[PDB]
Design a protein around this ligand. Sequence first.
Ligand code: BX2
Length: 370
Amino acid sequence: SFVEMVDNLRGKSGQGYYVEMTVGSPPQTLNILVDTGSSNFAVGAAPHPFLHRYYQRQLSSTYRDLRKGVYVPYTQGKWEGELGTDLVSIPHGPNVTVRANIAAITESDKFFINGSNWEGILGLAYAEIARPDDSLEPFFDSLVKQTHVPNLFSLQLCGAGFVLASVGGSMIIGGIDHSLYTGSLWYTPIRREWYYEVIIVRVEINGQDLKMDCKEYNYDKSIVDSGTTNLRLPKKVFEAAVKSIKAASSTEKFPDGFWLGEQLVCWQAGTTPWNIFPVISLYLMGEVTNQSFRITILPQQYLRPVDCYKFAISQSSTGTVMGAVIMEGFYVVFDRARKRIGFAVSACHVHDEFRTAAVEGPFVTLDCGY
Ligand SMILES: CCc1cc([C@]2(c3cccc(-c4cncnc4)c3)N=C(N)N(C)C2=O)cc(CC)n1
């Protein structure tokens, strides 16, 4: 059923996962980054040094102007555009076509990426964080309202596994594909419908509790974001994490340029000492008040291939971000209809013959949110 949706994702390590889409009439083929960390469908629609193709409104008989501009600035650069609607389809997705909002980006700074091979972004989060405001209905809402596609989608991000390494995965829209995971799916509630916000109740390095007030883990928030490469942690949690990881791997020594995630380290062909780095367990709030469950990730996940790797755990000023390197261990279900997110061991996750990524619960925790 979702057989046609299997392996419908591709990308370059560190530069996000994208799915093929068409926009307009006749269909204009574009690769669009799948992003759970935003809520705009925004596509390059003017020439750019990093873009080799873009959305051309005038070539589309079905385009309709909303006569309204949008301007989204931030720290690095920004993105500017003009709002409109057009017919939209996902060739290796459900067999439907939808009229959706489209932000045609006419100018931008440090937004696109050189060689990433995508030309736009599909924000899969909620209207509350849409630009310019929450009246601009996001793609998935339009898709559900207009078709009979169930209000749910799931992601299997598979990473590389053994020129930036290529990655693959699957976005199953409208259902759960049981051949994509093994064992049980565990659900944590979506605390609030803007980002895909969740609550982390504790974290351990090699079974060792960091022993923090759990408000620190979600300060000022925790989100599941496919549009973020790294596991990103609040400063206080980050320092304690690195310190613990440093200890466990202190049989070998690396420069703190590595620990700061901007310096690579290299072994040569199959000699990488995985067993020297500890596993990391995040406990997420369960559907029952005082329950939780844990997802455990291996060094194969938080050391990103560049045999050279970069430390894919970094510091945050905007709360915890569970990005690709965390999702790559699991099958992640965004159950919008029941306000929840399920985690299960992925049928594609990378691991060795002594350890393996895991989803295990329940654990009883006898206030953690901002
Ligand atoms: C409107 C859509 C949008 C998306 C984003 C981004 C984004 C934008 C462009 C590229 C990436 C990216 C993803 N993987 C790897 N390398 C880069 C992410 N997506 C998320 N989740 N994050 C955290 C973002 O910085 C930022 C903004 C500005 C408010 N706006």
